[PDB]
Design an enzyme around this catalytic site. Sequence first.
Site, short mmCIF file in Angstrom:
data_model
loop_
_atom_site.label_atom_id
_atom_site.label_comp_id
_atom_site.label_asym_id
_atom_site.label_seq_id
_atom_site.Cartn_x
_atom_site.Cartn_y
_atom_site.Cartn_z
N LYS A 1 -9.87 5.91 19.63
CA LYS A 1 -8.50 6.35 19.99
C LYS A 1 -8.58 7.37 21.13
O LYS A 1 -9.64 7.96 21.39
CB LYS A 1 -7.75 6.90 18.79
N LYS B 1 -14.54 9.70 23.69
CA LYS B 1 -15.30 8.57 24.26
C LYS B 1 -16.01 8.99 25.55
O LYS B 1 -17.21 8.72 25.69
CB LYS B 1 -14.38 7.40 24.56
N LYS C 1 -6.90 6.60 32.19
CA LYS C 1 -7.05 8.05 32.50
C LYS C 1 -8.05 8.22 33.67
O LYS C 1 -7.92 9.17 34.45
CB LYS C 1 -7.43 8.79 31.22
N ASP D 1 -6.59 2.49 21.54
CA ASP D 1 -5.34 2.68 20.74
C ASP D 1 -4.61 1.36 20.51
O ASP D 1 -3.83 1.26 19.55
CB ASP D 1 -4.42 3.67 21.44
N1 LIG Z 1 -18.44 17.27 20.61
C1 LIG Z 1 -17.53 17.91 21.34
N2 LIG Z 1 -17.53 19.27 21.34
C2 LIG Z 1 -16.58 19.90 22.05
N3 LIG Z 1 -15.59 19.39 22.78
C3 LIG Z 1 -15.64 18.05 22.78
C4 LIG Z 1 -16.54 17.26 22.10
N4 LIG Z 1 -16.30 15.92 22.34
C5 LIG Z 1 -15.27 15.92 23.15
N5 LIG Z 1 -14.81 17.18 23.43
C6 LIG Z 1 -13.65 17.49 24.25
O1 LIG Z 1 -12.55 16.75 23.75
C7 LIG Z 1 -11.69 16.35 24.85
C8 LIG Z 1 -11.49 14.86 24.80
O2 LIG Z 1 -12.75 14.19 24.98
P1 LIG Z 1 -12.82 12.85 25.87
O3 LIG Z 1 -14.23 12.39 25.88
O4 LIG Z 1 -12.18 13.07 27.22
O5 LIG Z 1 -11.89 11.86 25.02
P2 LIG Z 1 -11.47 10.33 25.33
O6 LIG Z 1 -12.30 9.90 26.50
O7 LIG Z 1 -11.80 9.61 24.04
O8 LIG Z 1 -9.99 10.36 25.65
C9 LIG Z 1 -12.34 16.93 26.12
O9 LIG Z 1 -11.80 18.21 26.44
C10 LIG Z 1 -13.80 17.08 25.71
O10 LIG Z 1 -14.49 18.09 26.41
MG LIG Z 2 -11.88 9.16 28.37
#
Ligand SMILES: Nc1ncnc2c1ncn2[C@@H]1O[C@H](COP(=O)(O)OP(=O)(O)O)[C@@H](O)[C@H]1O
Ligand SMILES: [Mg+2]
Lengths: 283, 283
Positions: free
Chosen positions: B10, B15, B41, B129
Amino acid sequence: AMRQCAIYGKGGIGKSTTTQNLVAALAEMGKKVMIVGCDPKADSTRLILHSKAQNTIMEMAAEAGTVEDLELEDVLKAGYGGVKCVESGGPEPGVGCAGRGVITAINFLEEEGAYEDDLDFVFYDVLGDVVCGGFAMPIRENKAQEIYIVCSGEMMAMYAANNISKGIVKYANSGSVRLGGLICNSRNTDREDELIIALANKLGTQMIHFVPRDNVVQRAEIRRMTVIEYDPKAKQADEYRALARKVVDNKLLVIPNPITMDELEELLMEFGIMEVEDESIVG
Amino acid sequence: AMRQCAIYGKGGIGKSTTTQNLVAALAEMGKKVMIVGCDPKADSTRLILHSKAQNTIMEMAAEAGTVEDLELEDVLKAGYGGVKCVESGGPEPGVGCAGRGVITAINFLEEEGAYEDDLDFVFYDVLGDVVCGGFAMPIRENKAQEIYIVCSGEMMAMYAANNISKGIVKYANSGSVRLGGLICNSRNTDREDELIIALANKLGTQMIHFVPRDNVVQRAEIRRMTVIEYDPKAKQADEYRALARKVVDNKLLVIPNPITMDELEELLMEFGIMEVEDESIVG
Ligand SMILES: Nc1ncnc2c1ncn2[C@@H]1O[C@H](COP(=O)(O)OP(=O)(O)O)[C@@H](O)[C@H]1O
Ligand SMILES: [Mg+2]
Ligand SMILES: Nc1ncnc2c1ncn2[C@@H]1O[C@H](COP(=O)(O)OP(=O)(O)O)[C@@H](O)[C@H]1O
Ligand SMILES: [Mg+2]
């Protein structure tokens, strides 16, 4: 007159909890309301109906033959405060278009006379991670004049708010779809209220309410109730009543000004959302 | 041989952070890797490229005339450890289908010879999602044989994992798309590792790694780096190396057994995820 409202936002942000509690508060005031579930998760009405969920138009049409074999009195169920409830449904993962059920559901409700003169409000609870197909339909086809976006200090929640705002801009040459407000559903993160107020001001709207993070929501939902029904004296019940009052009284409905990812990143850096190392209230 | 992997989950679940850090760890080992961004994104490559993001195939095709006017050496950029990076992009909100860019991007990469014999891994970072249009394509058209789902103890994250698993089942009569594992990206919630191990066992897979919640991720990402590059001696760098080792060594690739919402609700109730009132480590 009736006010057609849609609650948009990313997955898991609190659209269904917020919508069902807001609507329970409107019913408690004496308002007549219908909720239309526009999320394939299809649990947007369970707290009004005291139920696991609700059988969807897509599911029932398939059992009856066609959608024209269904009767309104069969897809539409009344729960708490006489709130009327319906679920669109959608295709199973990997089949067709996840939003196809919303188109079928809204057209069915319009044709079959669901929009009775004495409804005060309709709320569509809409998946907002993608703005396309049936999920865009309430905006593209002028079904929900007042969009309220549930969000938080999470970059993804704010990105989704900005994307929904871009969809509203795209269809502003036609119809009357407007951004009514942001609803901050608290992560218990410090200065989060200030962050979403700042985002709302950049978009040209307002933060209509800050909804606190309160475990009473989990205790109510385990019993398939809104907080309004489960514990009407809870602080969180008064929070949903405050949101409901501000929605009733709201007159600011704008064509929003979507921002850049640079502006989104600057907001998070400004309010120290990424440099914080604990929740505001621990516990 | 090359292993074609996709990271689903999600919105906001982690990811892109997980994929870029896992891939940085693979490059650090001496593996040749390509990341294909399949999320509108379009910030799935920024930590490898030290960049704001990357210009998308959809954006560049429009500037060049057609996608056939683009050259590989123009959509594909190398960053940390020589990791090759490309972004699909997608239409603006409210226009067409949010996943349309993924179809165009993957077909372009295949035609233009992106899949060079000496690649060890390809990772697609895919919005999860909704499982439809271009987002379903890596599963429907047999592009990613190994699906890894990033999730957490959040009902919405587990629901998304179950939906992706239903998509894998639907296309199991054709191709070789399999569920490789769940990756638990920690919410700092108590017994969350046990919860995702339990979910993985119900689906017939494994929890390949528990990734801790560590602020060093925020400090690395403000500087547009993976933790692997920003602080190779960080505990969190070793966590991503552990994930990378287990992905390299993984041989369990299954047709999953999707569960009921009743089973999902029972898991959360069993591990006391909804009755908890604070984070495991406060701070
Ligand atoms: N293990 C983690 N520890 C701290 N912050 C994290 C961790 N995994 C992800 N984040 C933070 O969570 C947010 C969303 O992560 P992201 O990889 O961009 O999600 P997605 O790609 O699934 O939308 C970002 O600000 C990222 O830095
Ligand atoms: Mg992403
Ligand atoms: N203000 C809140 N306080 C506590 N828990 C909340 C709050 N808002 C939502 N939740 C919980 O968050 C989860 C996701 O909310 P939900 O309304 O189902 O999200 P969505 O409909 O946007 O996917 C649910 O477990 C719900 O009880
Ligand atoms: Mg919902």
